[PDB]
Amino acid sequence: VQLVESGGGLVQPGGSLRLSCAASGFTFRNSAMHWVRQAPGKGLEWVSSIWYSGSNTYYACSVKGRFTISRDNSKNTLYLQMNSLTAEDTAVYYCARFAGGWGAYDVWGQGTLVTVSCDIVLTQSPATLSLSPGERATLSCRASQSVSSNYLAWYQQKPGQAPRLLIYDSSSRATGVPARFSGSGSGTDFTLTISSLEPEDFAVYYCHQYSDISPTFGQGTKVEIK
Amino acid sequence: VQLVESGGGLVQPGGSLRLSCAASGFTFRNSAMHWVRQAPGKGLEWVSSIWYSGSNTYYACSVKGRFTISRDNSKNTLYLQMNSLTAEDTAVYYCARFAGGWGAYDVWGQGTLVTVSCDIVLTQSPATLSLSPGERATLSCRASQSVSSNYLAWYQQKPGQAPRLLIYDSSSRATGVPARFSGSGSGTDFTLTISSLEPEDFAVYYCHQYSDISPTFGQGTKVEIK
């Protein structure tokens, strides 16, 4: 009684792969068959299920509209057709026989890895600054490698609004930006200093490097009232 | 000087939408134009870039192979064609003019929300258990609503291996599982107890409800050596 899995491998986003699972040792046509996946370092996640011709196939929302489950009972084979793949679909994929009250997922395929794949990382600190008006906020943006030509910008974002450019070229204030916003630093260490905070200044602030063709943003620092 | 965005809305996974951005106030035909997005409650993320005809278009790996950036300079309009949409593409999408060392993203569209959408949540606690051989491990699995027929299972998973069924129907220890594994509980409160831990028992353990057509797993508990 076993499920012999086949397929997988490394593809580019938008590509497609077909997985298969050959069953033996049980009456295949009577069993419901599921796909389950597990992203690297993550937990198990149901993907899709299929039972008998005329009963419903089901899909997790994560794959619905792109993946197709099917079976060929004469071949004792379960399939998963994976179309328009995304990097987020990277995972080990398992087929499993579903035994319901007689055993949940009691037979598993060995799993096959599907990897979908095609960089300056900005780390902002701290994540949150709880401060009062009149005080000074100092925001740090550290880059995993040197940011060429000080091509670093800071944006302010209020809730429900588009980002607003504050600083570009690490230290140049954009039009309309008050002197109490000050950018500085170089190489891998950049800071935004906001002196004598006003209530309007409480917002999220993102740093942005445009020193290469793969632009990156920090994860933001939220400055909030105390 | 502005970017007037339009489009967006709510679609189902695998569907498609086209966004657009009409520019005025600057020489659009010569501009570098980017799309940037922001998942709800999350940070800014570059999506795609387009510039003069003798240059290439670029895409973040998150959208490459599914999205297409384009421009119609005679209409001063930028487009993003979004195909095979995914729940993870849910985000506010911004167009922006890119000015490099003369201003980074210095003009922003106001943003439009794209939502892509179509549940018994299992909460395992604690997340990790540091124990030594001979001690007893007690693992909890809490369901957000009642698990019909107590259709709840436990799996053991070792690194590089497929999950192994231990318990189903809340308390049925599968054939071949040692008696030191014991499942109990009902309704929304389930427990796996591993008495007299042996070296082979250190692993990750998942619970799994199969009481409806949308199977779910807990996020696992790692039982690890102290």
Residue numbers in the entry:
A (entry chain G), B (entry chain A): 2 to 119, 125 to 232
What do the authors report?
Diabodies are among the smallest of these bispecific antibodies. They are constructed by connecting heavy-chain variable fragments (VH) and light-chain variable fragments (VL) with short “GGGGS” peptide linkers. Therefore, the two VH-linker-VL chains associate to form a dimer with two antigen binding sites, each consisting of the VH and VL fragments from the different chains. In order to investigate the structural flexibility of the Fv interfaces of diabodies, we have determined the crystal structures of 10 mono- and bi-specific diabodies with and without bound antigens.
